Amino acid sequence: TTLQEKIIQELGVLPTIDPKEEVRKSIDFLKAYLTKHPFLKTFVLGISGGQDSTLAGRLAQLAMTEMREETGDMSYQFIAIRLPYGEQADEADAQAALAFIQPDVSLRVDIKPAVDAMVGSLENAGVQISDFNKGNMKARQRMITQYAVAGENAGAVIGTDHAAENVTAFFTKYGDGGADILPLFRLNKRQGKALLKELGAPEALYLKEDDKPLVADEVALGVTYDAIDDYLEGKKVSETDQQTIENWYKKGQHKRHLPITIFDDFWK
Amino acid sequence: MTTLQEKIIQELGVLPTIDPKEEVRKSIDFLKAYLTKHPFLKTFVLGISGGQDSTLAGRLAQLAMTEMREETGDMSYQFIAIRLPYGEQADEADAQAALAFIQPDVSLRVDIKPAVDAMVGSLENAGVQISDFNKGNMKARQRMITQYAVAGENAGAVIGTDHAAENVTAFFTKYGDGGADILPLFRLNKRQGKALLKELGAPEALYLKKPLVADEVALGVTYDAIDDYLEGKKVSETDQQTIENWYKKGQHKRHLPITIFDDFWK
Ligand SMILES: NC(=O)c1ccc[n+]([C@@H]2O[C@H](COP(=O)([O-])OP(=O)(O)OC[C@H]3O[C@@H](n4cnc5c(N)ncnc54)[C@H](O)[C@@H]3O)[C@@H](O)[C@H]2O)c1
Ligand SMILES: NC(=O)c1ccc[n+]([C@@H]2O[C@H](COP(=O)([O-])OP(=O)(O)OC[C@H]3O[C@@H](n4cnc5c(N)ncnc54)[C@H](O)[C@@H]3O)[C@@H](O)[C@H]2O)c1
Known part of the structure; x- marks a missing residue:
C-alpha cells in the first residue's frame, strides 16, 4: 500500500458519495450519540459564515429538530454562536448562514476584549504576539467560548474538521480543532459542497470559462482544494502537488494524535 | 477475557514497581529523542503552579534541555516556565519554591485574570451566566492559550502534566491543562511521581505532606486507592466502583473528537 492509499483509509474518504445518503449518515451519527449520552441536551457551534461551519451547523440543527420530535423532549436544541473579533467586523456572511441554518438559539x-487582554498580559512579560500567532489565539479563544456555553447547557461542541482540512492539518491545535464530535469527518472539500447543495443551501454559501480564482486557504497551503480532493478520492495528481500534500500531512502529524506519550511510535 | 482493571493498567502503562532513577532517565531521554527528531523545536513551555505534577514535569524538561545544550552546543535549547496566576491575591509562595528547585532558563x-474576566463579561453580555465550576475550566483553557502563545513565538512544545492517576479519573479540563504537546509523566501514578521527585532531590515541602485534600474530596476516592488500583492491587468494592465510574465518564477526554468511525462510545 502507498501513503496516499493509507491516508485515504485513515480519513475514510470515498471517491464518490451519495450526498442525500451522507446527510442521513451525518445526522443519524449525531442522534445516536445523544441517545447513548442522555446527559447531553444541546449542540454548540460557532458560525463563521464559511462552508464548513454552515454545513456542520445545518446538520446539527436538523439532528436536534428530529430529536425533539421523536422524543418529545424540548431540551434538545442547537445553539449557534457568532464569534466576531471586534465590533465593526462584517457579519453579513455569518448571518447569511444563520438564515439557512435557522438555529434554535442564536x-x-x-472575543476581542478577551484576546486583547491576553495579548496585553503577554506583552507585560516581554512576549510580543505575531500576526499569525494572534490568529491562532483567536481560534483558541473561540474554542473557550463554545465550551463555556456548552458547559452551561449540558452541550457538546460540534467540530468542523473534515478530510481536506485533516490531511493538511489546516486548523489550530486546541482551537477550531478542539471539539467534541465531528459530523463532517470523512468528506473532502467538494463533497462538503455537494451536501450543502443537497440540503438546499443558497449557492452563495459554498461558491463565491477561465481558471477559478484562489481562496486564502489555498494561498497558504500552496496547493488547491481540487488537487487535495482529487488526492483523497484516489485520483492521480501531479508529482509537485502530491509532494505538497504529503508534506503537510507529515508536518501536522502531532495535530492528528493525542499528546505524545513515551509509548507512541508514529513520530519516530 | 481480561478485567477492566487489567485493560486500564495496560492502556495507561502503569508498572506495579518502578526504578525511580531509571524512570527519570526514560523521561529525559524521551524528551531529548523527540527534540532530536524535530529540529524545528527549540524550547519547552510549561506552567508552574507549585504542585507535584508541574514541578516534576518542569524539572525533567529543564534537565533534558541542559543535556541538549551540552550535547549539541546549541544555546537556543531552553525551558520556559510561566507562572499563570489568577489575579494578585493568589499566593505565589508554593509556585516560587518550585522555581527554586527547577532553576529554569526562562521564568x-x-x-490570566484580565483575559478570563473579559471572556466572562462578553459572555454575560450575551445572556450567558458563568458558574464558578465553568469558570474553573475557563481558567485552565486560558492557561493553555498562554502556554501555546509562548510556544508559538519561541518554536516550542508545550509540556503536559497528565499522568496515570489523572488519566483514570479524567481529572483535567478538556483542552485546558489536558491540551499539551508531549507528556513526560505519562505512565506514572501519583506516588511514583513523588518517588521521582525524591530521586531528583526536590525538597520535602514540595511532595510530602486526617486533613482533607481537595482532589480526593471531589473524586470521592483517595490517591492511595487510585495508585493501588493502577499498581494491580485489589481495592474495596466501593473504591473500585468509584474509579471505574470516572474512567467510563471521561472516555471522551482520552480520545480524539468523535468521528463516525469510532466505536468506543457505543
Ligand atoms: N501563512 C498562513 O496562512 C498561516 C500562518 C500560520 C497559521 N495558519 C493557520 O493556523 C492554523 C495552525 O497553524 P500553526 O501550526 O502555525 O499553529 P498551531 O498552534 O495550531 O500549531 C503549532 C503548535 O503546535 C506545537 N507543535 C509544533 N510542532 C510540533 C511538533 N512536531 N510536535 C508537537 N507539537 C508541535 C507547538 O506547541 C506549536 O505552538 C492552521 O489553520 C494554519 O492554516 C496559517
Ligand atoms: N467539585 C470539583 O472539585 C470540580 C467540579 C468540576 C470540575 N472540576 C475540575 O475540572 C475538570 C474538568 O472537568 P469538567 O467535566 O467539569 O470540564 P470539561 O470541560 O473537561 O468536560 C466537560 C465538557 O466536555 C464535553 N463533554 C461532556 N461529556 C461529553 C461526552 N460524553 N462526549 C463528548 N463530549 C462531552 C462537553 O463539551 C462538556 O462541556 C475536572 O476534572 C476537575 O479537575 C472540579
Whole structure:
C-alpha cells in the first residue's frame, strides 16, 4: 500500500458519495450519540459564515429538530454562536448562514476584549504576539467560548474538521480543532459542497470559462482544494502537488494524535 | 477475557514497581529523542503552579534541555516556565519554591485574570451566566492559550502534566491543562511521581505532606486507592466502583473528537 492509499483509509474518504445518503449518515451519527449520552441536551457551534461551519451547523440543527420530535423532549436544541473579533467586523456572511441554518438559539459573543487582554498580559512579560500567532489565539479563544456555553447547557461542541482540512492539518491545535464530535469527518472539500447543495443551501454559501480564482486557504497551503480532493478520492495528481500534500500531512502529524506519550511510535 | 482493571493498567502503562532513577532517565531521554527528531523545536513551555505534577514535569524538561545544550552546543535549547496566576491575591509562595528547585532558563509571569474576566463579561453580555465550576475550566483553557502563545513565538512544545492517576479519573479540563504537546509523566501514578521527585532531590515541602485534600474530596476516592488500583492491587468494592465510574465518564477526554468511525462510545 502507498501513503496516499493509507491516508485515504485513515480519513475514510470515498471517491464518490451519495450526498442525500451522507446527510442521513451525518445526522443519524449525531442522534445516536445523544441517545447513548442522555446527559447531553444541546449542540454548540460557532458560525463563521464559511462552508464548513454552515454545513456542520445545518446538520446539527436538523439532528436536534428530529430529536425533539421523536422524543418529545424540548431540551434538545442547537445553539449557534457568532464569534466576531471586534465590533465593526462584517457579519453579513455569518448571518447569511444563520438564515439557512435557522438555529434554535442564536448568540453573539465578541472575543476581542478577551484576546486583547491576553495579548496585553503577554506583552507585560516581554512576549510580543505575531500576526499569525494572534490568529491562532483567536481560534483558541473561540474554542473557550463554545465550551463555556456548552458547559452551561449540558452541550457538546460540534467540530468542523473534515478530510481536506485533516490531511493538511489546516486548523489550530486546541482551537477550531478542539471539539467534541465531528459530523463532517470523512468528506473532502467538494463533497462538503455537494451536501450543502443537497440540503438546499443558497449557492452563495459554498461558491463565491477561465481558471477559478484562489481562496486564502489555498494561498497558504500552496496547493488547491481540487488537487487535495482529487488526492483523497484516489485520483492521480501531479508529482509537485502530491509532494505538497504529503508534506503537510507529515508536518501536522502531532495535530492528528493525542499528546505524545513515551509509548507512541508514529513520530519516530 | 481480561478485567477492566487489567485493560486500564495496560492502556495507561502503569508498572506495579518502578526504578525511580531509571524512570527519570526514560523521561529525559524521551524528551531529548523527540527534540532530536524535530529540529524545528527549540524550547519547552510549561506552567508552574507549585504542585507535584508541574514541578516534576518542569524539572525533567529543564534537565533534558541542559543535556541538549551540552550535547549539541546549541544555546537556543531552553525551558520556559510561566507562572499563570489568577489575579494578585493568589499566593505565589508554593509556585516560587518550585522555581527554586527547577532553576529554569526562562521564568515568565502572565496573569490570566484580565483575559478570563473579559471572556466572562462578553459572555454575560450575551445572556450567558458563568458558574464558578465553568469558570474553573475557563481558567485552565486560558492557561493553555498562554502556554501555546509562548510556544508559538519561541518554536516550542508545550509540556503536559497528565499522568496515570489523572488519566483514570479524567481529572483535567478538556483542552485546558489536558491540551499539551508531549507528556513526560505519562505512565506514572501519583506516588511514583513523588518517588521521582525524591530521586531528583526536590525538597520535602514540595511532595510530602486526617486533613482533607481537595482532589480526593471531589473524586470521592483517595490517591492511595487510585495508585493501588493502577499498581494491580485489589481495592474495596466501593473504591473500585468509584474509579471505574470516572474512567467510563471521561472516555471522551482520552480520545480524539468523535468521528463516525469510532466505536468506543457505543
Ligand atoms: N501563512 C498562513 O496562512 C498561516 C500562518 C500560520 C497559521 N495558519 C493557520 O493556523 C492554523 C495552525 O497553524 P500553526 O501550526 O502555525 O499553529 P498551531 O498552534 O495550531 O500549531 C503549532 C503548535 O503546535 C506545537 N507543535 C509544533 N510542532 C510540533 C511538533 N512536531 N510536535 C508537537 N507539537 C508541535 C507547538 O506547541 C506549536 O505552538 C492552521 O489553520 C494554519 O492554516 C496559517
Ligand atoms: N467539585 C470539583 O472539585 C470540580 C467540579 C468540576 C470540575 N472540576 C475540575 O475540572 C475538570 C474538568 O472537568 P469538567 O467535566 O467539569 O470540564 P470539561 O470541560 O473537561 O468536560 C466537560 C465538557 O466536555 C464535553 N463533554 C461532556 N461529556 C461529553 C461526552 N460524553 N462526549 C463528548 N463530549 C462531552 C462537553 O463539551 C462538556 O462541556 C475536572 O476534572 C476537575 O479537575 C472540579
